[PDB]
Amino acid sequence: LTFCEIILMEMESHDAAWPFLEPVNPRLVSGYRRIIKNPMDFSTMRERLLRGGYTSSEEFAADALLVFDNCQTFNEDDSEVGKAGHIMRRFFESRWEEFYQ
Numbered sequence: 001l002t003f004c005e006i007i008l009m010e011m012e013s014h015d016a017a018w019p020f021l022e023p024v025n026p027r028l029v030s031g032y033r034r035i036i037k038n039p040m041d042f043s044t045m046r047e048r049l050l051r052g053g054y055t056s057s058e059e060f061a062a063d064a065l066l067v068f069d070n071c072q073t074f075n076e077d078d079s080e081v082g083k084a085g086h087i088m089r090r091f092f093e094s095r096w097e098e099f100y101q
């Protein structure tokens with residue numbers, strides 16, 4: 001899972017990562033809690049990873065993909081947040097394939 005941490009750090013430093021660094025505060029984003037039932041973000045992933053809460057790379061990847069699937073459900077593809085989610089998903093998938101094929 002050290003390679004999960006490497007990928008997480010690269011995601012956290014990406015130019016398109018800004019929507020995903022911290023949990024969405026649903027008080028500030030109308031409809032978020034109604035539409036997205038299983039929120040996820042990179043800081044929540046980091047807290048779990050550091051504490052040993054992922055028992056396989058698959059569990060970590062499922063949380064990453066949940067970030068991107070939530071983003072695609074909630075936001076238009078041509079919105080700033082939606083565009084960022086598509087970039088981040090492809091970045092994740094590309095880096096993932098280097099360590100986990």
Ligand SMILES: CN(C)CCn1c(=O)oc2ccc(NC(=O)c3ccc(=O)n(C)c3)cc21
Nearest residue numbers: 018019020024029032070071074075080081
């Ligand atoms: C103007 N506008 C494009 C940016 C505003 N803006 C900012 O200046 O700093 C931010 C920091 C975080 C957020 N996040 C969200 O808007 C959001 C909305 C739906 C969603 O699914 N996610 C994952 C994130 C927005 C901002």
